[PDB]
């Protein structure tokens, strides 16, 4: 029963329940002295029983007693039990000290074991350590001297903070923590700002995107916790998914796009047919504007194979490759075949590179290789200049004719229905079938037009080449997008479902390039709302399943 600000008092409902019990007990004791009718004493005993059961468990016997504010009083069983109960709110989970939280940005310069920590957050989190070091090295006589020096934010406080955070790991967490990769240990690097800088390669483990996400930071205190963070929870140790064994640090988005662009092959590029002494001269030719990234050349490659038994065989040969492939080989660790690089590198190819490096070299080489891969991918994706424009969405000319044919055939089958040849259900089913076929054919035509181009080769004729369209490169590399999304952008949106589940007959014959009209957008909303609400409910269902399994 405590005083609040403004003179008001705050109490627990247990006080009211206990007061009721005591009042009824005293009344019963009084009624057994002033000898009373048996009916009155019986009623009072009924009161006493009801009050005790209300105190122990309100609502089980019957109508739950409410307070002056007209909601049921909370009993001891309610204190003990439930999602809000002591077991789950305060015993199985707690609020902890030496913890902070902030928005997360991206640090592309970081190493896999590093995270950017703001200076003010580090000053607040490591305050006792700073006090200890100031007292130890003598600039603070007492603890208020150290507190005043930290509050005034002197320079020597900053050097002390650097020395305390020099090799003290911190724990980064993002909610929801679906698996153990949702909490990992990093070495902090003090940065100016208020946002935590996160290594890109760990985002897939955190399911983290930089659209407003917040992360929590915890400081392990004792030596055992520090060594657990360094040995077990550190980001370099957790690179394999415990669910399947596959690497979880596989590159994505700009890294994949850059490695794809640098390893692509162009016909009649500048510097074709040149002979290069090795990857270094390929780099020199690219930097001197002698040859393009996509020139077909012959390069001398020295390749070392580490066999299963540990045999290391080194041998050199001349290989027909591309300048970008050799420049990428420059960062590949020794012990790997060159066939892993001599191709256009999509997401699967880079994942295979990392998996092979881990299988045949180990862990340290794998983390160094991953860091270099991400640096190179970022650099050459920046250098590529890949951009999206309205002209990158080429709508095939066959789409209009296919729509006209489908509409004419739909008119024909409507005529057949009006003659009684076919029933309504048959008409519905085959109209659905014809629109599905039309959608598939329009998608195929748009893919065929988008995926190829004609170029002039050295000898002068015309040759077929894989396209360098920005959207096509985005989809094929595996960075972002799949065939369905390009179909929606430059083909047809297709059949959409009524909220009950039925599929409307007429599809949306428009993509997002020419734009939908009012009714097409309304049908689109019909399914968009369903998807969003389904996600909202399925999240809770999955969480409850995971709890039960745990």
């Amino acid at each position: 029963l405590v005083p609040l600000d403004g003179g008001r008092f705050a109490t627990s409902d247990l006080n009211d329940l206990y007061r009721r019990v005591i009042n009824r007990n005293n009344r019963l004791k009084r009624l057994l002295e002033l000898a009373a009718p048996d009916i009155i004493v019986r009623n009072e005993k009924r009161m006493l029983q009801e009050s005790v059961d209300a105190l122990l468990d309100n609502g089980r016997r019957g109508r739950a007693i409410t307070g002056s504010n007209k909601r049921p009083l909370k009993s001891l069983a309610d204190m003990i039990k439930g999602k809000q109960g002591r077991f789950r709110q305060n015993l199985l989970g707690k609020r902890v000290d030496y913890s902070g939280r902030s928005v997360i940005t991206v640090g592309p310069y970081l190493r896999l074991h590093q995270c950017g920590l703001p200076k003010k957050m580090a000053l607040e989190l490591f305050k006792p350590f700073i006090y200890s070091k100031l007292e130890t090295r003598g600039l603070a006589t007492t603890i208020k001297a150290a507190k005043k020096m930290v509050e005034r934010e002197e320079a020597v406080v900053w050097d002390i903070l650097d020395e305390v955070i020099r090799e003290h790991p911190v724990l980064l967490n993002r909610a929801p923590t679906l698996h153990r990769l949702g909490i990992q240990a990093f070495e902090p690097v003090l940065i100016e700002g208020k946002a935590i800088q996160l290594h890109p390669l760990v985002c897939a483990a955190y399911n983290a995107d930089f659209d407003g996400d917040q992360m929590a930071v915890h400081v392990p205190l004792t030596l055992e916790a520090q060594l657990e963070a360094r040995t077990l929870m550190m980001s370099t140790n957790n690179i394999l998914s415990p669910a399947s064994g596959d690497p979880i640090i596989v590159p994505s988005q700009d890294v994949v796009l850059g490695l794809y662009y640098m390893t692509r092959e162009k016909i009649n590029a500048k510097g074709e047919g040149m002979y290069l002494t090795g990857p270094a001269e390929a780099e020199k030719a690219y930097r001197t504007k002698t040859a393009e990234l996509h020139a077909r050349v012959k390069v001398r490659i020295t390749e070392t194979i580490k066999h299963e038994n540990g045999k290391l065989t080194t041998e050199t040969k001349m290989i027909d490759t591309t300048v970008g492939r050799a420049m990428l080989w420059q960062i590949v660790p020794k012990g790997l075949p060159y066939s892993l690089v001599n191709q256009k590198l999509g997401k699967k190819q880079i994942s295979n590179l990392l998996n092979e490096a881990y299988r045949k070299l180990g862990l340290k080489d794998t983390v160094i290789f991953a860091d270099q891969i991400m640096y190179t991918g970022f650099a050459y994706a920046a250098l590529s200049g890949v951009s999206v424009g309205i002209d990158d969405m080429v709508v095939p000319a066959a789409k209009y004719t296919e729509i006209a044919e489908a509409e004419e055939e739909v008119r024909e089958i409507q005529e057949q229905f009006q003659s009684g040849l076919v029933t309504a259900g048959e008409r519905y089913n085959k109209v659905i079938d014809i629109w599905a076929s039309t959608n598939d054919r329009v998608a195929k035509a748009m893919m065929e037009n988008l995926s190829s181009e004609q170029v002039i080769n050295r000898q002068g004729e015309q040759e077929k080449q894989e396209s360098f369209n920005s959207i096509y490169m985005m989809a094929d590399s595996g960075a972002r997008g799949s065939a369905a999304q390009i179909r929606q952008l430059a083909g047809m949106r297709g059949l959409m479902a009524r909220p009950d589940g039925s599929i409307i007959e007429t599809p949306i014959t428009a993509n997002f390039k020419e734009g939908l009209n009012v009714l097409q957008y309304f049908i689109s909303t019909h399914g968009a709302r369903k998807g969003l609400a389904d996600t909202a409910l399925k999240t809770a269902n999955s969480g409850y399943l995971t709890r039960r399994l745990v």
Partner: peptide, 10 residues
């Protein structure tokens, strides 16, 4: 038939 002490008392 009832659990409320009010009605039983009446």
């Amino acid at each position: 038939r009832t659990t409320d002490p009010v009605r039983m008392y009446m």
